[PDB]
Amino acid sequence: IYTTLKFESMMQQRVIQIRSIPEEEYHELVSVQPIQVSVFVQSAAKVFTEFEQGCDTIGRSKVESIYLYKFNLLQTAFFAMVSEKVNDWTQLYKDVRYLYTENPKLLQLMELNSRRLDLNLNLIKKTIYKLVNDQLQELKDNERTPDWDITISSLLPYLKKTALPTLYKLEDNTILVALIRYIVHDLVIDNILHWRVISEKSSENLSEFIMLLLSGLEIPRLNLIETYRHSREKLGILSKILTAHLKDILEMFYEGEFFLFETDEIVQWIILLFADTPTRRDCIDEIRRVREEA
């Protein structure tokens, strides 16, 4: 109870120093390695060096059992505050990965940070998830007179002047691949597959829409990533499926143009858009069978 006596009180000396990191350091940016962090990040190195420093006054053995409790808790405490002092959470996220680069002992700190990001991605996903089905829902209720507004004032401006420019600030091209993949695969196309039917007229409406989607999901820096081009090619192929009479459709399959379509998906796309005939039949068994022979 002597050892407990000092451990909570030096917890106080670092916390006073954290409140003491001068306020103007959370708003100014310093150049450091190339990434740019805020002026406080480098001062920040001292606090967690200083926690190891404060341990010398009775070390481990006398401290081993709560250190992880006490270490993780301190990492958690610092993390929460700087979100309210560092306005731009993306500016915020970059600082935090840089700190746990400098000293790879800040385990909880990365968990907090990676989850902080997961959140911000989901925020971007949720807002975008809402618009697309809704425009698609909008298309759904008035085939004849769609309100193209859903796309026009909020979704694309979001992407071009809001969603996407935000994502540039975070700089990690593996992740953007995860986001673009999300919209194309899990959002847009899947809802489209699950309508009861995609009216003959709805498809062209839908055709005007998605293409508008391609226009806002083009990230030139990524022409170099494989699935980025495969998503954009595929979507390019999806609009084309949507506005053709049956004969052009078999022609594509054979051309490998169904490279990005499962036979399951190829037939399902056949099943949703056009009425039952042998014509749909000869073509469907042909694709599953040529797919069978290969």
Partner: protein
């Protein structure tokens, strides 16, 4: 007279023989014979015979020149019974004459009357009246003989003795003889007259007019009236009848003696205290005092006019007697000041005109009397008349008296509204102040108490807030705002209005704020709003205000209220689970709080943060049931 004629005459006299007795009387040649005959007639004539039958003695004597011997001769001729009486031996005749003359003289001496030769008829009528009255007890038994007399002495005796005695005897059913009444002292005679079966003004008036006034006028002295009747022992002034008899006797124009006015005053001055135990006492005293005339010597150095002036204020002084009024002159200056202040306060009650004030001026330190007058108008809420009087007279009320009456009205007021009669009177009272700036705080107090009356406010549970209670909150004006937030749900979101009320309370109560901007008071006020909003389920507005509180320089003093937002749980949330959005907000405020809270609280604040972060990590943010 001839001895034989004297004996014969006595027989005719005792028989009531008017003819023979008148003929003998007209035959008498000398005044000595007439005197001897009138003595015999006075005693020996039958007392019950008509007084008119002896009226022949009042007629002038016709000297018919009949000799006594010729008359004696005719009488003995006509009545043979006289022979045995008149024709005896000389010694028998002398014995008869001497026995009869002794009886006649002894009878007259028994009445203390001597018939004088110079006044023979007057003394005969008086003697005969006493002889007859000794038998009949009628004091007017000789009225027919007296009415035929031209003697002023007999008329004065009739008016002064006989008529008073006849009225007294008829009134009391007494049979007092003239001789007994004339031998009473003047005091005893007046004492017999003052025996009244009932003491009423009508009875006393009849006795005065028909007994006492004629008797005292005949005696030539009114001294028996003041000694026996008109004294303090007979006039205790303890009944309306005794007082009205005193007023009636005090107005009699006889007697013009200084002793009357002294005795009248001694009755009023000794017994006038009993008058306090009449339709209008002041008017009765005024009428009595006016009846003395303007003789200042009677009044112990106060003029008639000064008494009449002083009488007008007796009701205002609660003084009911002249002796207590004179005693006020001997009282000290403090007692005199108190009485004069009561006079002015009583005279100025109700609706008054300028003449009411002029009457007090005619009666008239004047400054102290005027102060008591103004205090009485203030006391009675006569503000319209007070404002009119102050504007016309130029008299100023002392600011101390104004402030005393302000607090009197303010402390009685039932509520703070300027519609309340006592709040109106308190406000009117402050408008009399010559310098409003020196007492600005009293107007600030009226203003804030009116503002507070528009809200639901209670001093204690079940006790209404009165204006007077505002002074109890001087040590903590925030407690009024705390009670306002609890009782008025519309104020919970209106921080500007409650901050304005708090600034007005500090101004009115002369409480010094922490700084010019009320920085600490506003932080505390914001803390009380957040606490009240959380207690009422309004997490949104509590959160918005806790973001304003956390950015304040003194936010560390209020860390508990900020922490309460970070741990808030609404029992009406779905499944009693914190909505996911609210978890982000609570994390939101708890780690801003980690930068400002006391270092000793870091563990508790971090534990709430980690509990919310763990809960958030369990949620499927894609299919969030608690969104």
């Amino acid at each position: 007279m001839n001895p034989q004629l004297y004996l014969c005459a006595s027989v005719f006299i005792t028989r009531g023989d008017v003819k023979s007795v008148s003929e003998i009387y007209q035959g008498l040649q000398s005044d000595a014979e007439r005197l001897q005959y009138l003595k015999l007639l006075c005693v020996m004539w039958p007392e019950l015979d008509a007084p008119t039958n002896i009226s022949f003695v009042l007629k002038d004597i016709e000297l018919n020149g009949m000799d006594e011997s010729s008359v004696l001769v005719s009488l003995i001729q006509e009545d043979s019974s006289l022979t045995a009486i008149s024709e005896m031996d000389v010694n028998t005749i002398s014995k008869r004459v001497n026995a009869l003359a002794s009886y006649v003289e002894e009878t007259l001496i028994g009445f203390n009357i001597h018939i004088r030769e110079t006044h023979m008829l007057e003394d005969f009528i008086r003697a005969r009246t006493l002889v007859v009255n000794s038998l009949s007890k009628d004091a007017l038994c000789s009225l027919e003989l007296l009415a035929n007399s031209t003697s002023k002495s007999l008329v004065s005796w009739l008016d002064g003795i006989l008529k008073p005695l006849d009225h007294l005897n008829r009134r009391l059913d007494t049979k007092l003889s003239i001789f007994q009444f004339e031998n009473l002292s003047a005091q005893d005679a007046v004492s017999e007259m003052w025996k009244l079966p009932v003491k009423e003004v009508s009875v006393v008036r009849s006795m005065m007019k028909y007994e006492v006034e004629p008797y005292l006028k005949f005696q030539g002295s009114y001294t028996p009236f003041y000694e026996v009747i008109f004294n303090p022992d007979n006039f205790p002034l303890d009944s309306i009848n005794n007082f009205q008899i005193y007023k009636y006797l005090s107005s009699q124009p006889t007697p013009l003696d200084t002793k009357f006015n002294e005795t009248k005053w001694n009755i009023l001055y000794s017994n006038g205290k009993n008058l306090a135990s009449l339709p209008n006492l002041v008017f009765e005293l005024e009428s009595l005092i006016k009846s003395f005339g303007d003789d200042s010597q009677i009044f112990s150095g106060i003029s008639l006019n000064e008494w009449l002036v002083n009488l007008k204020f007796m009701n205002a002084m609660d003084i009911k007697d002249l002796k207590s009024l004179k005693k006020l002159q001997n009282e000290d200056s403090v007692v005199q000041t108190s009485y004069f202040s009561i006079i002015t306060q009583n005279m100025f009650q109700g609706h008054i005109d300028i003449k009411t004030v002029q009457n007090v001026v005619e009666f008239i330190t004047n400054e102290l009397q005027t102060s008591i007058l103004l205090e009485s108008l203030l006391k009675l809420g006569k503000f319209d008349i007070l404002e009119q009087f102050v504007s016309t007279s130029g008299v100023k009320i002392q600011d101390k008296v104004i402030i005393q009456h302000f607090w009197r009205f303010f402390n009685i007021a039932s509520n703070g509204s300027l519609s309340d009669p006592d709040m109106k009177n308190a406000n009117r009272t402050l408008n009399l102040l010559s310098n409003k700036e020196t007492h600005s705080n009293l107007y600030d107090i009226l203003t804030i108490v009116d503002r507070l009356s528009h809200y639901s406010l209670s001093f204690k549970r079940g006790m209404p807030f009165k204006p007077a209670h505002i002074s109890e909150f001087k040590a903590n004006p925030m407690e009024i705002v705390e009670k306002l937030l609890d009782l008025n749900p519309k104020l919970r979101k209106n921080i500007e209005v409650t901050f304005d009320i708090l600034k007005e309370l500090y101004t009115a109560l002369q409480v010094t704020p922490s700084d010019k901007d009320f920085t600490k008071e506003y932080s505390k006020l914001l803390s009380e709003h957040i606490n009240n909003l959380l207690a009422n389920g309004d997490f949104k507005f509590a959160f918005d205000q806790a973001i304003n509180l956390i950015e304040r320089p003194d936010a560390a003093e209020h860390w508990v209220t900020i922490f309460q937002v970070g741990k808030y749980i609404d029992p009406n949330w779905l499944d009693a689970e914190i909505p996911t959005e609210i978890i982000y907000l609570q994390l939101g405020i708890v780690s801003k709080l980690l930068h400002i809270c006391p270092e000793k609280e870091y563990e508790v604040i971090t534990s709430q943060w980690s509990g919310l972060e763990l809960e958030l990590s369990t949620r499927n943010l894609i299919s969030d049931k608690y969104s």
